[PDB]
Amino acid sequence: RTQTGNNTTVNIIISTVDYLLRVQESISDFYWYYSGKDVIDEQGQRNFSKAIQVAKQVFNTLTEYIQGPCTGNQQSLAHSRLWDAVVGFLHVFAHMQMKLSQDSSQIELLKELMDLQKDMVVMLLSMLEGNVVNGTIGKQMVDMLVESSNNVEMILKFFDMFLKLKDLTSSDTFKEYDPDGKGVISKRDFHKA
Amino acid sequence: NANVVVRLLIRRPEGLLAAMEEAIKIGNAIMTFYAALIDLLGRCAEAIRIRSILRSLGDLVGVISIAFQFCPDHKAAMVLFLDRVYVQDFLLHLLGFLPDLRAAASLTDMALALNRYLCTAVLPLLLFAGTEHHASLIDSLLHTVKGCSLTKAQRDSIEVCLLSRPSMMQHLLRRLVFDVPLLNKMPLKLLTNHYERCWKYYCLPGGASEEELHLSRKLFWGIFDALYEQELFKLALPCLSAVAGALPPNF
Amino acid sequence: QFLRTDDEVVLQCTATIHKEQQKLCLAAEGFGNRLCFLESTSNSKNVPPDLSICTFVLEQSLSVRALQEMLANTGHRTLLYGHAILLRHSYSGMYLCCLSTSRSSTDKLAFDVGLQEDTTGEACWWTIHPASKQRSEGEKVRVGDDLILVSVSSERYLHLSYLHVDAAFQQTLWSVAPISSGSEAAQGYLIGGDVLRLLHGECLTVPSGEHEQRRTVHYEGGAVSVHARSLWRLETLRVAWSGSHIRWGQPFRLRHVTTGKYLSLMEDKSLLLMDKEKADVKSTAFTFRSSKDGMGTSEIKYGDSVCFIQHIGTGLWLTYQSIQRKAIMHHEGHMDDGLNLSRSQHEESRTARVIRSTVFLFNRFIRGLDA
């Protein structure tokens, strides 16, 4: 964070925060490119999966930055500028998930972006522990996460409609509704049930 | 590339049109400099909002000024700018081809510019003044009556006959049948043989007009007895025979 | 601290007249003018600048992708740099557009600056960039950041030419003064810039047409509220947070609506209606008394307010002379010192600026015929 023993201090962590912000802006621009055509092909798939690997690495760095609960790093990154980039990542996430779900070819990139979402919220939980009761860090958490609160509808409906899907699909007029009990159930039959 | 270059010019462009028109009198390098500038600007064509900026930076003043004033490259760059950036009446309003077709036997920098303005006249291919332009084109073609560039000149004259009314077409076809007595040279013979199709398209709409038609029929009958490529001219002379049948339906 | 949807701001340069920082801001009339022009604020004391023809509203702003989507379609949304924005003229409801004409010098094709009806097209969209390496593009837009104004239609720097304003390839920074944001804030609350009446308990009035030449000040009972001559625009001596919540003690200019003139206690004679030049601090502005810098707490209201008024230079108080109840200023006066207020409305103000606009334009037209 500072190199106490050394002369001209440099926070290396604010620098990689700003790097991640640049990464996020370029991911956002990639989304605004593929936001219209919506049939994303192997060039963009491959390069964008590489970018998923980039961000997958760097959120793990951000975990192990503050996984040891040292409060100087907590106050540094709490005071940082990545918080709007967090909102931008969520706006990437929610709007990606729809067209990722609508493709059977994009299931790999969906899995990768889903894993990136997982690493993002793992980092967020890891830094979100150091609250005495409220915390000014907690103030800033809550305030910019309510500022986030427009795209969260999509991911929550996404989660519930993939989850209580399988919570429903073992019932009476579901499982022997097709006689094999495997998943050879037809479209309109499953739809009606 | 030209997008970013033009945006850099909208960062730093560096009354320039008035100062263009002065330094001819004495220095040639700044003239060729602005010519290269406008030629580079002519090499680009959503992005429609900067296609406006192509059209934005008054230009027709410089176009008409260089349309009749060395002489090859500046006017060629202006034609390249104008055709890409910027109907038929304003197209022929520029009469720039009038002094070029007038100086069609001026032999030497213009004698090198002649094949440049052959293919440059191909660029505007896409009522009296129309007769004047047909007269200037027939004057340049008889001056052409360079040969591979003269093929482009012949294609330009073919599209000039394809541009149309038929009254100026007959006015030029009179001179065409007059020069056909001088040949039926072989390029003017093939030019009149191609113009036989446009005369057929005029005479099918029409059916000393029939008098010149009978004179052309008698001259074609004499050229049929005056004797591949000449066979091609004779086979395209049958279009003039169909024109005469639709009628009967360097000086 | 930052900029969001629906923020009342202004744009201003401290322009150089031989390095004299002529603090001139953007002026646009509207409702009769489709052009934008300048307004000097360097003499904020004696010849004070106007407000409503200078304020603008952050309507809507997005990134490149957002803009593309919008063009394809045939809250607060906190501002980030590099974004095309939508500016409404807060008075006239028009929208800032680069006019594609050449009504200046020109000085080849830089283009004109004006207002229009629609939000459509690319002329209503204006990218913002910091001309500072200290701050980034796409990060948050703070209070008072000198920035770049570039359209999406013309894609040119909104340049302060000479006194012209054009879109060209020539940069011009612009100051941002937040005025009333955001929101504005709850009803029944005195926030400066508003036009309102003076409830006597009956109102204040100004003489009618072709009379003075409308410079005296009187009380009146009856339907002078329906008259526009009982209307009074609030005007701050300050610029930043002009649309703060109004508190007592702090003084403010007051300006008559229909003439455009300033409610001016000329200490020699009486309470008069003087012009822009005489509109000094202790000549026309009044300290606002309950006794005989941000949004601000909602100190004073419309329904319940005992508005004692003390003059700056003289200290006199809100009274009258012996309906031609000629309102004057005196050390005590009557027991009619702390009067009541009642707000005007939006369409009323939109008519109201058109009133004296009509006055100026048609009197100039009359005298142009007379010459």
Coordinates of N, CA and C in Angstrom, one line a residue, chain B residues 142-251:
Chain B
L142 N -13.1 13.9 -83.0 CA -12.5 14.1 -84.3 C -11.0 14.5 -84.1
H143 N -10.7 15.2 -83.0 CA -9.3 15.4 -82.7 C -8.6 14.1 -82.3
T144 N -9.4 13.1 -81.7 CA -8.9 11.8 -81.4 C -9.1 10.8 -82.5
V145 N -9.8 11.2 -83.6 CA -10.0 10.4 -84.8 C -8.7 10.2 -85.6
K146 N -1.9 6.8 -76.0 CA -3.2 7.6 -76.0 C -4.3 6.8 -76.5
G147 N -4.1 5.8 -77.3 CA -5.1 5.0 -77.9 C -5.9 4.2 -77.0
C148 N -5.2 3.6 -76.0 CA -5.9 2.9 -74.9 C -6.7 3.9 -74.1
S149 N -6.2 5.1 -73.9 CA -7.0 6.2 -73.3 C -8.0 6.7 -74.3
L150 N -7.8 6.6 -75.6 CA -8.8 6.9 -76.5 C -10.0 5.9 -76.5
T151 N -9.7 4.7 -76.1 CA -10.8 3.7 -75.8 C -11.7 4.2 -74.7
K152 N -11.1 4.8 -73.6 CA -11.9 5.4 -72.6 C -12.7 6.6 -73.1
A153 N -12.0 7.4 -74.0 CA -12.7 8.5 -74.6 C -13.9 8.0 -75.4
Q154 N -13.8 6.9 -76.1 CA -14.9 6.4 -76.9 C -16.0 5.9 -76.0
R155 N -15.6 5.3 -74.9 CA -16.7 4.9 -73.9 C -17.4 6.1 -73.3
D156 N -16.6 7.2 -73.1 CA -17.2 8.4 -72.7 C -18.2 9.0 -73.7
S157 N -17.8 8.9 -75.0 CA -18.7 9.4 -76.0 C -19.9 8.5 -76.2
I158 N -19.7 7.2 -75.9 CA -20.9 6.3 -76.0 C -21.9 6.6 -74.9
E159 N -21.4 6.8 -73.7 CA -22.3 7.2 -72.6 C -22.8 8.6 -72.8
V160 N -22.1 9.5 -73.6 CA -22.6 10.8 -73.9 C -23.8 10.7 -74.8
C161 N -23.7 9.8 -75.8 CA -24.9 9.5 -76.6 C -26.0 8.7 -75.9
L162 N -25.6 8.0 -74.8 CA -26.6 7.4 -73.9 C -27.2 8.3 -73.0
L163 N -26.7 9.5 -72.8 CA -27.2 10.5 -71.9 C -28.6 11.1 -72.3
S164 N -29.0 10.9 -73.5 CA -30.3 11.4 -74.0 C -30.8 10.5 -75.1
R165 N -32.3 16.2 -75.8 CA -33.1 15.1 -76.4 C -32.5 14.6 -77.7
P166 N -33.3 14.1 -78.6 CA -32.8 13.6 -79.9 C -32.5 14.7 -80.9
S167 N -32.8 16.0 -80.6 CA -32.6 17.0 -81.5 C -31.1 17.4 -81.6
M168 N -30.5 17.6 -80.4 CA -29.0 17.8 -80.4 C -28.3 16.5 -80.8
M169 N -28.9 15.3 -80.6 CA -28.4 14.1 -81.1 C -28.3 14.1 -82.6
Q170 N -29.4 14.6 -83.3 CA -29.3 14.7 -84.8 C -28.4 15.8 -85.2
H171 N -28.2 16.8 -84.4 CA -27.3 17.9 -84.7 C -25.9 17.4 -84.7
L172 N -25.5 16.6 -83.7 CA -24.2 16.0 -83.7 C -24.1 14.9 -84.7
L173 N -25.2 14.1 -85.0 CA -25.1 13.0 -86.0 C -25.0 13.5 -87.4
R174 N -25.3 14.8 -87.7 CA -25.0 15.4 -88.9 C -23.5 15.5 -89.1
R175 N -22.8 16.0 -88.1 CA -21.3 16.0 -88.2 C -20.7 14.6 -88.2
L176 N -21.4 13.7 -87.5 CA -20.9 12.3 -87.5 C -21.0 11.7 -88.9
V177 N -22.1 11.9 -89.6 CA -22.3 11.4 -91.0 C -21.3 12.2 -91.9
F178 N -21.0 13.5 -91.6 CA -20.0 14.2 -92.4 C -18.6 13.6 -92.2
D179 N -18.3 13.3 -91.0 CA -17.0 12.6 -90.8 C -17.0 11.2 -91.3
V180 N -18.1 10.5 -91.4 CA -18.2 9.2 -91.9 C -17.9 9.2 -93.4
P181 N -18.2 10.3 -94.1 CA -17.7 10.4 -95.5 C -16.2 10.5 -95.5
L182 N -15.5 11.0 -94.5 CA -14.1 11.0 -94.5 C -13.4 9.7 -94.2
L183 N -14.1 8.8 -93.5 CA -13.6 7.5 -93.1 C -14.2 6.3 -93.9
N184 N -15.6 6.3 -93.9 CA -16.3 5.1 -94.5 C -16.6 5.5 -96.0
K185 N -11.2 8.5 -88.1 CA -10.8 7.4 -89.0 C -11.6 6.2 -88.6
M186 N -11.0 5.0 -88.4 CA -11.6 3.8 -88.1 C -12.2 3.9 -86.6
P187 N -11.6 4.7 -85.8 CA -12.2 5.0 -84.5 C -13.4 5.9 -84.6
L188 N -13.4 6.9 -85.5 CA -14.6 7.7 -85.8 C -15.7 6.8 -86.5
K189 N -15.2 5.9 -87.3 CA -16.1 4.9 -87.9 C -16.8 4.1 -86.9
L190 N -16.1 3.5 -85.9 CA -16.7 2.7 -84.9 C -17.6 3.6 -84.0
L191 N -17.2 4.9 -83.8 CA -18.0 5.8 -83.0 C -19.3 6.1 -83.6
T192 N -19.3 6.3 -85.0 CA -20.6 6.5 -85.7 C -21.4 5.2 -85.8
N193 N -20.7 4.1 -85.8 CA -21.4 2.8 -85.8 C -22.1 2.5 -84.5
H194 N -21.5 3.0 -83.4 CA -22.1 2.9 -82.1 C -23.3 3.9 -82.0
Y195 N -23.1 5.1 -82.6 CA -24.1 6.1 -82.6 C -25.3 5.8 -83.5
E196 N -25.1 4.8 -84.4 CA -26.2 4.3 -85.1 C -27.3 3.7 -84.2
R197 N -26.9 3.1 -83.1 CA -27.9 2.5 -82.2 C -28.7 3.6 -81.5
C198 N -28.0 4.7 -81.1 CA -28.8 5.9 -80.6 C -29.6 6.6 -81.6
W199 N -29.2 6.6 -82.9 CA -30.0 7.1 -83.9 C -31.2 6.2 -84.2
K200 N -31.0 4.9 -84.0 CA -32.1 4.0 -84.2 C -33.1 4.2 -83.0
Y201 N -32.6 4.4 -81.8 CA -33.5 4.7 -80.7 C -34.2 6.0 -80.8
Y202 N -33.6 7.0 -81.5 CA -34.3 8.2 -81.8 C -35.3 8.1 -82.9
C203 N -35.0 7.3 -84.0 CA -35.9 7.2 -85.1 C -37.0 6.3 -84.9
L204 N -36.9 5.3 -84.0 CA -38.0 4.5 -83.6 C -39.0 5.3 -82.8
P205 N -38.5 6.3 -82.0 CA -39.4 7.3 -81.4 C -40.0 8.2 -82.4
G206 N -39.2 8.5 -83.4 CA -39.7 9.3 -84.5 C -40.4 8.5 -85.6
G207 N -40.6 7.2 -85.4 CA -41.3 6.4 -86.3 C -41.1 4.9 -86.0
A208 N -34.7 19.0 -92.3 CA -34.0 18.1 -93.1 C -33.6 16.8 -92.4
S209 N -34.5 16.3 -91.6 CA -34.3 15.1 -90.8 C -34.3 13.8 -91.7
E210 N -35.4 13.6 -92.4 CA -35.4 12.5 -93.4 C -34.5 12.7 -94.6
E211 N -34.3 14.0 -94.9 CA -33.3 14.2 -96.0 C -31.9 13.8 -95.6
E212 N -31.5 14.2 -94.4 CA -30.2 13.7 -93.9 C -30.2 12.2 -93.7
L213 N -31.4 11.6 -93.3 CA -31.5 10.2 -93.2 C -31.2 9.5 -94.5
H214 N -31.8 10.0 -95.6 CA -31.6 9.4 -96.9 C -30.2 9.7 -97.4
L215 N -29.6 10.8 -97.0 CA -28.2 11.0 -97.4 C -27.3 10.1 -96.6
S216 N -27.6 9.8 -95.4 CA -26.8 8.8 -94.6 C -27.0 7.4 -95.2
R217 N -28.2 7.1 -95.7 CA -28.5 5.8 -96.3 C -27.7 5.6 -97.6
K218 N -27.6 6.7 -98.4 CA -26.9 6.6 -99.6 C -25.4 6.6 -99.3
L219 N -24.9 7.3 -98.3 CA -23.5 7.2 -97.9 C -23.1 5.8 -97.4
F220 N -24.1 5.2 -96.6 CA -23.8 3.9 -96.1 C -23.9 2.8 -97.3
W221 N -24.7 3.0 -98.3 CA -24.7 2.2 -99.4 C -23.4 2.3 -100.2
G222 N -22.9 3.5 -100.3 CA -21.6 3.7 -101.0 C -20.4 3.2 -100.2
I223 N -20.5 3.2 -98.8 CA -19.5 2.6 -98.0 C -19.6 1.1 -98.0
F224 N -20.7 0.6 -98.3 CA -20.9 -0.9 -98.4 C -20.2 -1.4 -99.7
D225 N -20.1 -0.5 -100.7 CA -19.4 -0.8 -101.9 C -18.0 -0.2 -102.0
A226 N -17.6 0.6 -101.0 CA -16.3 1.2 -101.0 C -15.2 0.2 -100.7
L227 N -15.6 -1.0 -100.1 CA -14.7 -2.0 -99.7 C -14.7 -3.1 -100.8
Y228 N -13.2 -7.7 -90.7 CA -13.3 -7.9 -89.2 C -13.8 -6.6 -88.6
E229 N -12.9 -5.7 -88.3 CA -13.2 -4.4 -87.7 C -14.0 -3.5 -88.7
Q230 N -13.7 -3.5 -90.0 CA -14.5 -2.9 -91.0 C -15.8 -3.7 -91.1
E231 N -15.7 -5.1 -91.0 CA -17.0 -5.9 -90.9 C -17.8 -5.6 -89.7
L232 N -17.1 -5.3 -88.6 CA -17.9 -4.9 -87.4 C -18.6 -3.5 -87.6
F233 N -17.9 -2.6 -88.2 CA -18.5 -1.3 -88.5 C -19.7 -1.5 -89.5
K234 N -19.5 -2.4 -90.5 CA -20.6 -2.7 -91.4 C -21.8 -3.4 -90.7
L235 N -21.5 -4.2 -89.7 CA -22.6 -4.9 -89.0 C -23.3 -4.0 -88.1
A236 N -22.6 -3.0 -87.5 CA -23.2 -2.0 -86.7 C -23.8 -0.8 -87.6
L237 N -23.5 -0.8 -88.8 CA -24.1 0.1 -89.8 C -25.5 -0.5 -90.1
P238 N -25.8 -1.8 -89.9 CA -27.2 -2.3 -90.0 C -28.1 -1.7 -88.9
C239 N -27.6 -1.2 -87.8 CA -28.4 -0.4 -86.9 C -28.8 0.9 -87.6
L240 N -27.9 1.5 -88.4 CA -28.3 2.7 -89.1 C -29.3 2.3 -90.3
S241 N -29.2 1.1 -90.8 CA -30.1 0.6 -91.8 C -31.5 0.4 -91.1
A242 N -31.6 -0.1 -89.9 CA -32.8 -0.2 -89.2 C -33.3 1.2 -88.8
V243 N -32.4 2.2 -88.6 CA -32.8 3.6 -88.3 C -33.5 4.2 -89.6
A244 N -32.9 3.9 -90.7 CA -33.5 4.4 -92.0 C -34.8 3.6 -92.3
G245 N -34.9 2.4 -91.8 CA -36.2 1.7 -92.0 C -37.2 2.1 -91.0
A246 N -36.8 2.6 -89.8 CA -37.8 3.2 -88.9 C -38.1 4.6 -89.3
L247 N -37.2 5.3 -90.1 CA -37.6 6.6 -90.7 C -38.5 6.3 -91.8
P248 N -38.4 5.2 -92.6 CA -39.3 4.9 -93.7 C -40.5 4.1 -93.2
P249 N -40.7 3.9 -91.9 CA -41.8 3.2 -91.3 C -43.1 3.9 -91.4
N250 N -11.5 20.7 -87.5 CA -10.6 20.3 -88.6 C -11.2 20.7 -89.9
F251 N -12.3 21.5 -89.8 CA -13.0 22.0 -91.0 C -12.2 23.1 -91.6

